[PDB]
């Protein structure tokens, strides 16, 4: 058979090339690839879908699909036999999967800590909010307690994680929605009262430093590898970078206990790439057959000898999981217990974010969470 593919220039890796080469060699599917310059790809894909000339398989950005209507353009893959093998199945707002993902996640947020420092000062892995506060207290008795690094989005990762967890997958999506269409009224967001309270308490006790929050990732790495930071909350990509810089460092990773339900789910970025099937294709069956082969352990294993990042599927031997993420990989990631943090969405980025810079409201004397919500709403109007 034949299959046509549309992909981003910079995403047409040796990984995918060899994947498509195997497909032609072993499965008798002649694949023709059409690459588009990355900054142009969303424009081009939209146009080709609109005029119906789009290739059989197209690269898409998960989870939001460039705001395209998948029920118009893409095959619903939710019932394909390989869906159970996904670690974190991509979903639209109805829970349906419209692409084969190349990774389960871009970024996982966790509390990373220096196991040796914890041992030195008799600190145990915090398994609750009070244990976190106590852990910070002992560090101050003995080194910045809880370090944070700067981002290009609001709210900061720490508050984003906590808000996302209390609201859950639907609630978090709705929050981005109403923030983005400007219908939100922050004084109605009383579900956020306790997590803003927690945030405030960290500032109050000096466990997080407002003046340090603009610290670059490079600075966190520099200080962490010199035993100047006990705990860092943020992206596992930062933890990876710490280990790269100091291979012998003894790093642990656990849930940040900042909400009553923190142990239930991890947050992160699920803004991964995927391959969707063009609904109006005359070769939909062939496309679906191809994705099924691509999803197979043999192909995933070959792919991840080249492709970087976290695996998309269960039992991808060639995908390396960082040792520090080992526990969380088994407890949460492998079980799909991950949802997208509200700061990971494009709308959240300053380019002007749809979310408030809540930390900017925290001055001396500190306001209440009620006052922070009023301030957020005042800036809205």
- Three-class DSSP category at 32: strand
216 binds Cl ion (CB under 5 A): yes
218 binds, among Br ion, Cl ion, none (CB under 5 to 8 A by kind): Cl ion
| Pairing between β-strand 273-277 and β-strand 57-61 as defined by DSSP bridges | antiparallel
310 binds Br ion (CB under 5 A): no
Task: Using the rule CB under 5 A, give the single segment among 97-105, 129-137, 215-223, 292-300 that binds Cl ion.
Answer: 215-223
What burial letters (b/e) apply to 120-156, b meaning 16+ CB within 10 Å?
A: eeebebbeebeebbebbeebeeeebbbbbbebebbbb
358 binds, among Cl ion, Br ion, none (CB under 5 to 8 A by kind): Br ion
CB of 74 to Cl ion, least distance (A): 7
* Tokens encoding 198: 């927690």
What residues contact residue 280 under an 8 Å CB cut-off, 6+ apart? 52, 54, 73
Q: Which residues precede chain breaks (C–N over 2.5 Å) in the chain? A: 142, 351
User: Which of 359, 347, 361 shows the shortest CA–CA distance to 178?
Assistant: 347
* Tokens encoding 156: 């900061």
Between CA 213 and CA 137 the distance in angstroms is: 19
Q: Which of residues 158-187 bind Br ion (CB under 5 A)?
A: 159
Task: Using the rule CB under 5 A, give the single segment among 9-17, 78-86, 153-161, 175-183 that binds Br ion.
Answer: 153-161
Q: Which of residues 335-374 bind Br ion (CB under 5 A)?
A: 358-359
Of 22, 156, 213, 278, the residue at the interface with Br ion (CB under 5 A) is 156
Nearer to Cl ion by C-beta: 75 or 172? 75
Of 63, 70, 89, 155, the residue at the interface with Br ion (CB under 5 A) is 155
155 binds, among Br ion, Cl ion, none (CB under 5 to 8 A by kind): Br ion
Nearer to Br ion by C-beta: 209 or 250? 209
75 binds Cl ion (CB under 5 A): yes
Footprint on this chain of Cl ion (rule: CB under 5 A): 75-76, 216-218
């Amino acid at each position: 058979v034949r299959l046509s593919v549309l992909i981003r220039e910079k995403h047409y890796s040796s990984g995918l090339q060899n994947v498509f080469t195997k497909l032609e060699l072993e499965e008798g599917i002649a694949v023709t690839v059409e690459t588009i310059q990355d900054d142009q790809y969303p424009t081009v894909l939209h146009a080709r879908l609109a005029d119906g000339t789009a290739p059989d398989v197209v690269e898409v950005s998960l989870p939001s699909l460039h705001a395209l209507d998948p029920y118009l353009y893409f095959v619903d893959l939710s019932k394909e036999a390989w869906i159970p093998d996904l670690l974190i199945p991509p979903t639209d707002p109805y829970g349906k999967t419209f692409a084969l993902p190349l990774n389960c996640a871009v970024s996982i947020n966790a509390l990373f800590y220096n196991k040796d420092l914890f041992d030195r000062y008799g600190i145990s892995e915090p398994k609750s909010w009070n244990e976190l506060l106590e852990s910070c207290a002992l560090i101050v008795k003995s080194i910045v307690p809880l370090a944070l690094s700067t981002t290009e989005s609001f709210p900061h990762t720490l508050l984003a994680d906590a808000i996302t967890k209390v609201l859950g997958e639907q609630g978090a999506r709705d929050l981005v929605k109403r923030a983005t269409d400007d219908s939100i009224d922050w004084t109605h967001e009383r579900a956020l009262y306790p997590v803003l309270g927690a945030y405030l308490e960290l500032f109050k006790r000096g466990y997080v430093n407002k003046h340090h929050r603009t610290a670059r990732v490079r600075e966190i790495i520099h200080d962490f590898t010199r035993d100047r930071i006990a705990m860092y909350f943020g992206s596992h990509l930062v933890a990876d970078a710490i280990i790269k810089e100091r291979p012998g460092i003894n790093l642990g990773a656990c849930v940040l206990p900042i909400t009553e339900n923190a142990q239930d789910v991890l947050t992160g970025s699920l803004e991964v790439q995927g391959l969707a099937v063009h609904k109006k294709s005359a070769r939909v069956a062939t496309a679906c057959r191809a994705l099924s082969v691509l999803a197979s352990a043999a192909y995933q294993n070959s792919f991840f000898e080249e492709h970087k990042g976290l695996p998309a599927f269960r039992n991808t031997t060639s995908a390396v999981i960082p040792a520090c993420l080992s526990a969380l990989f088994k407890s949460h990631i492998e079980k799909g217990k991950v949802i997208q943090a509200i700061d990971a969405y494009a709308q959240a980025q300053n380019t002007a974010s749809v979310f408030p810079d809540f930390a900017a409201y925290v001055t001396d004397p500190a306001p209440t969470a009620h006052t922070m919500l009023h301030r957020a709403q005042t800036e809205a109007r």
